[PDB]
């Protein structure tokens, strides 16, 4: 097995500014050469060590023939730095931002964020981690040896053409169920192998698939100890037998290495439309851990951090967002899927869900024009994305109850809100799981309703607006996303 | 919107459910037609995008014994054959 790659950790130079170049180039998957992209690389980019309260500047240089963005997924920073409208870097271009970090130590990432292009630009290889350190977490004595017992694990699926090149297509099927493939890339590698000390192994897991949700576990069923979520540490470690992770979410887990017993990290088959076709019908290996006589470094504390109380939940401005996949898109996408893969497709959510004759006929009558441009078929609140109108203005420094509905379709909708770390009160109609009570920047929405308590501490204008979107990328690209603004009330 | 005149046999099928007019809008035909199918059991209880008209008057109208309420443009072309568009 090939040895797992470790993204270069990236602090500042004499001038506290990090340099990131957005290039293309070549990578090799199972001996077939493909064209891939990357931040300071052929592939996937680096880990940007940031230090809370101490700011740094980032020059972003774009050596693609085409344009792209750079979203700091998980950061509490003004809508300026994201950019939004005219936050676009044109080919050969420069952009410079400053990141004054103010949020607890956390494992965030960055990825291209342009409505219409995110799906493909990500699929190409653009990704990259941000590692935030505060003083609290250093005083903690977690495993700290980057690339040894503290390991980024970026897990992604891709599909490849006959050529060995990446095969993306934003057709009506991938706009419906997502772009998903058959080859699983752990930090870019296929089934790599990592060499761990005996002791605790810290793994910063990141689901970077386009639509594929993952569900981590170990080949031999040792528990994973979750110690942090999207936005930072949990209060105490949550012991779990399996860890489902959605697109763009991160969890830092600890695992125990004792004997020379090797064992794989695996992702278990998941109850999601189109994600339990072979080879993901069965448990699938993410990477193999092999223990050797390397130095260990950390412990599994019984407390990790303090977490503030929640403010009384009335008086709080409340906003309902209702996600909606245009029903024609659903019917059609599922036809493409039910043809291509037999009925091994819907396996996992395959049961009594049906659709009446009256619904079918009302669908017929409704697109009498035969005008069905599926590039706006996904909507929040009834209308798809238009950069022109931020949907609303929410208050700075103020607590608010956002309620995201997803009733009417059974399509997974991991829902992302920029410029904040928030807390989940309801996640798809149930109270959040023990480890998703933390800080999160993504919420499951699958046929039901979630409610999050959110507060933005950073200004964002119509010019550079915050977003909110499904992080199933092909949904975000085909309309399921809005903008919003935040300013200190006049 | 769009206003139309049902050719004879379609008009016949249209009044079997309670229509009375001689010149309808499109949404009006779609309504009464779906009403006809759901009154005469014509869909299959299990797969109910599937309409079985072989032995019915609708079978002669459309010229088939079956069709699927998913193939929209096809069912529209069958509908428009028995129409005279007035605009």
Author numbering:
A (entry chain A): 31 to 520
B (entry chain B): 25 to 111
What does the paper say about this structure?
To gain further mechanistic insights, we determined crystal structures of both the free and MDM2(6–125)-bound forms of CueO-PM2 along with CueO-12.1. The asymmetric unit for the MDM2-bound form comprised a single binary complex with the scaffolded PM2 peptide adopting its prototypical α-helical conformation. The three key signature residues (Phe, Trp, and Leu) projecting from the outer face of the helix are accommodated by discrete pockets in a prolonged hydrophobic cleft of MDM2. Comparison with structures of unscaffolded PMI, a related stapled derivate (MO6, differing by one amino acid), and the parental p53 peptide bound to MDM2 (32, 36, 41) shows highly similar side chain conformations of these residues. The adjacent MRS residues Met-396 and Asn-397 extend the PM2 α-helix to more fully occupy the MDM2 binding groove. The PM2 conformation is further stabilized by hydrophobic interactions between residues on its inner face (Leu-393 and Tyr-390) and Ile-358 and Met-361 on the α5 helix. In addition to a polar contact between side chains of Lys-94 of MDM2 and Gln-365 in the α5 helix, these interactions likely drive ordering of the MRS linker residues abutting PM2 that are highly mobile in native CueO. The MDM2-bound PM2 helix is positioned well away from the sCu and T1 copper-binding sites, permitting unhindered access to Cu and syringaldazine substrates and resulting in the observed MDM2-dependent activity gains. The structure of MDM2 bound to CueO-PM2 showed clear dislocation of the PM2 insert away from the sCu and T1 copper-binding sites, rescuing enzymatic activity. In the case of CueO-PM2, co-incubation with MDM2 resulted in ∼1.6-fold increased kcat (and no change in Km).
